[PDB]
Amino acid sequence: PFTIDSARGIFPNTLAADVVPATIARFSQLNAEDQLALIWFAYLEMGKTLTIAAPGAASMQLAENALKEIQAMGPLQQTQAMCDLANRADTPLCRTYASWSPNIKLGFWYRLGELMEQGFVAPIPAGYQLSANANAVLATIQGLESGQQITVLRNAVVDMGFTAGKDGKRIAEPVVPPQDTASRTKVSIEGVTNATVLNYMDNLNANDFDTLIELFTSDGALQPPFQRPIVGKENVLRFFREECQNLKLIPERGVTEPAEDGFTQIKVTGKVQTPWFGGNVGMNIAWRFLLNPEGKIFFVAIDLLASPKELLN
Ligand SMILES: CC1=C(/C=C/C(C)=C/C=C/C(C)=C/C=C/C=C(C)/C=C/C=C(C)/C=C/C2=C(C)C(=O)CCC2(C)C)C(C)(C)CCC1=O
Numbered sequence: 667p668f669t670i671d672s673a674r675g676i677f678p679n680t681l682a683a684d685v686v687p688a689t690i691a692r693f694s695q696l697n698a699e700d701q702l703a704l705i706w707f708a709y710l711e712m713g714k715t716l717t718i719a720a721p722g723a724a725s726m727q728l729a730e731n732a733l734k735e736i737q738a739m740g741p742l743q744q745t746q747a748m749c750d751l752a753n754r755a756d757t758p759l760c761r762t763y764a765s766w767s768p769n770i771k772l773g774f775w776y777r778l779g780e781l782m783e784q785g786f787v788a789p790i791p792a793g794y795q796l797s798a799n800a801n802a803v804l805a806t807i808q809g810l811e812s813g814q815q816i817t818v819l820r821n822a823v824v825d826m827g828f829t830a831g832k833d834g835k836r837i838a839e840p841v842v843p844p845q846d847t848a849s850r851t852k853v854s855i856e857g858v859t860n861a862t863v864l865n866y867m868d869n870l871n872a873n874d875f876d877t878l879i880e881l882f883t884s885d886g887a888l889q890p891p892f893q894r895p896i897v898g899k900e901n902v903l904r905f906f907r908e909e910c911q912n913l914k915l916i917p918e919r920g921v922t923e924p925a926e927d928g929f930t931q932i933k934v935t936g937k938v939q940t941p942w943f944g945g946n947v948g949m950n951i952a953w954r955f956l957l958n959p960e961g962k963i964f965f966v967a968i969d970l971l972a973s974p975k976e977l978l979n
């Protein structure tokens with residue numbers, strides 16, 4: 667008697683940074699022009715100390731057409747297209763944007779940000795003043811750990827556009843070939859020698875998604891931070907290929923415990939780096955694995971932890 671939804675409760679002591687979804691919820695109530703101005707301010711300040719990596723060439727080619735169209739617009743239509751995105755309005759641009767994977771959306775906005783700084787796309791009005799709720803939301807963001815700040819930014823970007831009733835076409839970056847076997851690193855985890863867990867981390871660090879997916883049970887699931895579980899090999903594999911490329915998992919230590927019915931539950935804590943920021947932002951992460959008797963992954967959750975004080979010991 668162990669289901670995906672019940673497995674979500676293992677290691678319930680684990681204190682996730684639920685300020686992140688809380689802040690996204692407050693952010694999403696705001697006026698669209700405040701949403702845009704708020705991210706503009708946060709992004710400008712964050713950039714004084716955090717350098718964002720340039721978008722990949724393939725991603726920028728996929729966003730090029732939409733970026734060209736916006737550039738050909740007059741300033742008022744440019745501002746209107748950005749508000750449409752933030753409002754999740756139903757427009758052709760908003761539907762194109764909603765078909766994109768997160769990295770393509772992120773590179774789209776990265777490039778609009780550069781063009782706004784250069785004055786080639788309508789900027790945020792000079793001297794713009796946020797609303798009462800918006801100033802408070804921005805203050806909250808600026809008080810978070812950098813790992814939490816960039817999660818808020820990405821989740822806000824992913825939220826934009828019109829994805830209503832959208833199980834249709836998905837546009838994503840091409841799949842990078844797995845790291846050659848001779849150059850792959852091998853993680854070490856204090857306390858944890860489980861082969862499934864170590865192979866999980868090593869294969870993801872090598873972008874070896876075909877090998878990684880075979881560690882899962884047919885009906886197994888993966889739960890990203892603050893998102894519902896992704897269920898089944900088909901869906902988990904799609905997620906890997908479209909959204910999980912070029913991560914760096916740096917686990918540190920863990921604990922291994924029996925679970926009901928010859929299962930095993932393992933919790934590991936450490937850091938994860940996104941290619942957007944590399945070593946400049948280390949996110950505090952827990953991994954919560956539920957393995958069946960054969961060692962297959964029935965459930966794995968990845969949690970963004972509330973602070974470094976939540977890392978094991
Ligand atoms: C929008 C906008 C702007 C632009 C703003 C811009 C350019 C914003 C860009 C912000 C960027 C690029 C943020 C990068 C975020 C990446 C994160 C949080 C990834 C974490 C990865 C994790 C947790 C991986 C976890 C994983 C592990 C380890 C697994 O083991 C399994 C897989 C899994 C994935 C779960 C302007 C500046 C133009 C202003 C207007 C405006 O609105």
Ligand SMILES: [Cl-]
Nearest residue numbers: 909940941942
């Ligand atoms: Cl990423």
